[PDB]
Amino acid sequence: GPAKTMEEASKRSYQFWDTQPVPKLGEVVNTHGPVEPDKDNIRQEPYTLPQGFTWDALDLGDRGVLKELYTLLNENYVEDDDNMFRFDYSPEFLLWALRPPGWLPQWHCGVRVVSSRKLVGFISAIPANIHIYDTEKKMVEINFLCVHKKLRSKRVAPVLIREITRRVHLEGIFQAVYTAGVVLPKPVGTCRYWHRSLNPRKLIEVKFSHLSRNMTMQRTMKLYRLPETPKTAGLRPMETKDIPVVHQLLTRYLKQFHLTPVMSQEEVEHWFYPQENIIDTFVVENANGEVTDFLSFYTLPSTIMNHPTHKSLKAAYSFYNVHTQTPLLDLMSDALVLAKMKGFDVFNALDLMENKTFLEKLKFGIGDGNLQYYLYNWKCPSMGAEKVGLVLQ
Amino acid sequence: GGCFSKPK
Ligand SMILES: CC(C)(COP(=O)(O)OP(=O)(O)OC[C@H]1O[C@@H](n2cnc3c(N)ncnc32)[C@H](O)[C@@H]1OP(=O)(O)O)[C@@H](O)C(=O)NCCC(=O)NCCS
Ligand SMILES: *C(=O)CCCCCCCCCCCCC
Ligand SMILES: [Cl-]
Numbered sequence: 001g002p003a004k005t006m007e008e009a010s011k012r013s014y015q016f017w018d019t020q021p022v023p024k025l026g027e028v029v030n031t032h033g034p035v036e037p038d039k040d041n042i043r044q045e046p047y048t049l050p051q052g053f054t055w056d057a058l059d060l061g062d063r064g065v066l067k068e069l070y071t072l073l074n075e076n077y078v079e080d081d082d083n084m085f086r087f088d089y090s091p092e093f094l095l096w097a098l099r100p101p102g103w104l105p106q107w108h109c110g111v112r113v114v115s116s117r118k119l120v121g122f123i124s125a126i127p128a129n130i131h132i133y134d135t136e137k138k139m140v141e142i143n144f145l146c147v148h149k150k151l152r153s154k155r156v157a158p159v160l161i162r163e164i165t166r167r168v169h170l171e172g173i174f175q176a177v178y179t180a181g182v183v184l185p186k187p188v189g190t191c192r193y194w195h196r197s198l199n200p201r202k203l204i205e206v207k208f209s210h211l212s213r214n215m216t217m218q219r220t221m222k223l224y225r226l227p228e229t230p231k232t233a234g235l236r237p238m239e240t241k242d243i244p245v246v247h248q249l250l251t252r253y254l255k256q257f258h259l260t261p262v263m264s265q266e267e268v269e270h271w272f273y274p275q276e277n278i279i280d281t282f283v284v285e286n287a288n289g290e291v292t293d294f295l296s297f298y299t300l301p302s303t304i305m306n307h308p309t310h311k312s313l314k315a316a317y318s319f320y321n322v323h324t325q326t327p328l329l330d331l332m333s334d335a336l337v338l339a340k341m342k343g344f345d346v347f348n349a350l351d352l353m354e355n356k357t358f359l360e361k362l363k364f365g366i367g368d369g370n371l372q373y374y375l376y377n378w379k380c381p382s383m384g385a386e387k388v389g390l391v392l393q
Numbered sequence: 394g395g396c397f398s399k400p401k
Contacts, residue, residue, distance in 0.1 A: 080397040087397060145394050181396025193398030209400045302397065348398070369398025392395070 002182035004370070006190075009183035016158040021377040023186040032133060034174065035377045042169045047159050049111060053120065055163065058108040060098055066091050068119045069110070074303065076148050078181070081368060084207065085302045085313060089144075093299065096278050097143065097393040101266045102127040104171070107140070109164050111156070120148035123160040125168050129262040130177055130390075131254075132188075133380055136262060140168050141392060142178035142376075165376075176376035177259075179392055181369055188259065188375050189352075189388045193367035194359045196347040197224045198340045206310045208346065209365065224363060228341070230334035232326055238281035238294065243269045245291040246283065246322075253322040257353060257389025259373065272296055272320075279319070282338065284326050292325035295335045297347070298393065316342075318349035319391055329358045336362065352388040 003009035010025055018024075021035035046055050060066045070091045079086045089097075098108060103126055111121030125140035142164065147156045168176065195209065200220050203209040211220060238246060247268040254260040263271065272281045277299050284293035296319035304310050316339040323331050332349075339347045349355050349364065350371060373388055 078395055078397050080399055085397055085399070087395065143394055179395060181398075193396065195398065195400045365400035367398030368401050369396040371396045371398075 004182060006183055006187075014185055016155075016161075017185045020185075022184075022374070023379055025183070025185045027186075029186075029379050029381050031379050032135065032381075033379055035379055038174045039169060043166055047163045047166065049159060050154065050156070052114050053111050054114050056110045056112045056119075057106045058110045058119075058122070059105060060095055060108060066094065069094060069108075069122060072119045072122060072148065073144065073146055077144070077146050079305075083305065085304055088301045088303045088312065090277065090299075090301070092275070093278050093393070094144075096270075096275060098124055098126065100126050100270045101264065106167050107164065109160065109167065111160070120151050121156055121160055122146045123164045125164050125176070127173070128177070129264075130175070131260045131262050132375065132378065133258050137175050137378070138173055139175040139177055140173055142176050143392060175378045177390065178374050178376070179371050180374065181371065183372060184374060186374070187372040187382065188380060189373040189383045189385060191350040191352045191371045191373065191385045191388055193369045193371060194349050194351060194355075194364035195367050196336055196349070196362060196364045197345075198226070198336065198347055199345040200224045202310065202313075202345050206304050206307060206313065208313060226337050226340050228337070230337045232284055232293075232330055232334050234285040234287070235282050235334055236285060237274050238272060238283050240273070242283050242291055242294075243273065246272055246281070246294055249291070249294060249322045249324065250320060253324075254389050258383045258387040260389040280316075280338065280342070281319075282334070284331075286325065293323050293331055295321045295331050295338075297335060297339060299344075300393075314343060314345045316344040316347045317391075318347070318355065321353075328354055329361060332358045332362055350388075350391070351385045352391070353386065356386060 003012050058065050077087045107125040109123050123145045124143050128141045130137050130139045197203050247265045274281050279298045281296040283291045285291050297316045298319050300317050302313040
C-alpha cells in the first residue's frame with residue numbers, strides 16, 4: 001500500500017525501491033551526483049514477465065494500437081482519492097506526449113496477455129535534457145505507468161520499471177525524472193495542486209468541489225465569474241513565427257529555478273505550438289510587434305465514474321507561463337478567461353515556480369493531492385516547490 | 394505518472 005505523507009511513508013519498508021539507485025527516505029543529501037556509476041554492460045534480455053504475458057512495444061502510429069493504449073489508460077490509469085474521477089487522456093494527447101523529438105518505439109513499453117492480446121500494462125520514457133541545480137544531464141521522463149486493475153498487487157509494476165530502465169540504459173542514459181502522487185524514496189521536491197473553478201455549478205453537482213462553509217450556490221457563482229474577454233493588449237494564439245522568441249523567453253525565464261527542462265527549438269515547437277484540445281499557447285505581442293510574454297495550458301479531461309448524467313470533467317492544466325512585461329497575475333487572469341471561453345470546467349495549477357504569487361489572489365483552492373518530484377540515479381538536496389520549474393503531462 | 398487532485 002502507498003503512503004501519501006513523508007511521515008506515513010517513513011514507517012514503510014520499500015521492498016523494490018530499496019534495491020534501486022535512489023536515496024533513502026530518511027537520509028539527508030548534501031552531495032550532487034549519480035547514486036551509482038554508469039554501467040558499461042547492459043542486460044540484453046527483457047525481464048521475465050509472469051506466465052501468460054509478453055512484452056510488446058506499442059507503435060502509436062498504428063491507429064488501432066493507439067486506441068488500445070487509450071482504452072487501457074481510460075479504464076485503469078490514475079484516479080482521485082475517492083475513486084470518483086479518472087484521467088481520460090485523449091489519443092491525440094497521447095501522441096503529443098509520447099512522440100516528442102527523439103522518441104523511441106521501444107520506450108513505449110507495453111504488456112499484453114499472450115492468448116487474448118489484451119493490453120494490460122504500460123510504461124513510457126521520452127528523452128529530455130534536464131537542468132538540476134548546476135548540472136545539465138540527458139535524461140528520460142518516465143510517465144504513464146499503468147497496470148490493469150485485474151493485474152494489480154502482483155509485483156508487475158517493478159518489472160515494468162526495471163524493463164524500461166534496461167531499455168533506457170541500452171541507449172546510454174542513466175538518469176530519469178518522474179512524478180507521483182505517492183511518497184517514494186525520495187522526493188527532490190513536493191508540489192501541491194490548486195484548482196480554480198470555472199463552471200462551479202457542474203463541479204459541485206459532480207462533487208469535484210464543495211460549497212464553502214457559509215456560501216450559497218448563487219454566491220459561489222458570483223465569486224468565480226470571469227470577464228468574457230482577456231484584458232492584456234496584444235494577446236493572441238502562438239504562431240509558427242513565434243517559435244524562436246518563445247524558445248528564447250522560456251530559456252531565460254527557467255534559469256531562476258533549480259529543476260528545469262532544457263528545450264531545443266524543435267522541442268519548443270512540439271510542446272507549445274497550439275493543437276486544439278491538447279495544448280494552448282497565447283503570446284503577448286506589444287505595440288512594437290515584440291513578443292514579451294506567453295501563457296500555456298494543456299487539455300486533460302477526466303471521466304466521472306458512476307454518474308448517470310455527468311460523464312466527463314474538462315480540466316485545463318497550467319503548463320509554462322513566462323512574463324517579462326505583462327504581470328504574471330494579469331497573464332494568469334487571462335489564462336482563466338481563455339480556459340472559461342474554451343469550455344473548461346476547472347483550471348488546475350501547481351504551487352511550483354512563481355505560481356504561489358497568484359494562486360490565492362485568483363481564487364484558486366488548495367487541492368488534496370501532492371505531486372512528488374523524483375530523480376533516478378541522481379543525488380542532490382531537495383528543493384521547495386517554488387524552485388521546481390518542470391511540468392510533465 | 395500524475396496525481397488527480399480535487400479541492401480540499
Ligand atoms: C501505479 C500502479 C502501476 C502500481 O501497480 P500495483 O499492482 O498496484 O503494485 P505492484 O504489486 O505491481 O508493486 C508494488 C511496488 O511498486 C511501487 N509503486 C507503487 N506505485 C508506484 C508508482 N506510481 N511509481 C513507482 N512505484 C510505485 C510500490 O512502492 C511497490 O514498491 P515497494 O516494494 O518499494 O513499496 C498501479 O496501481 C496503477 O496502475 N495505478 C493507476 C495508474 C497510476 O497510478 N500510475 C502511476 C502514476 S504515478
Ligand atoms: C509515472 O508514471 C512515473 C512512474 C515512475 C516509475 C519509476 C521510474 C524510475 C525510473 C526508471 C527509468 C530509469 C532510467 C535510467
Ligand atoms: Cl510510437
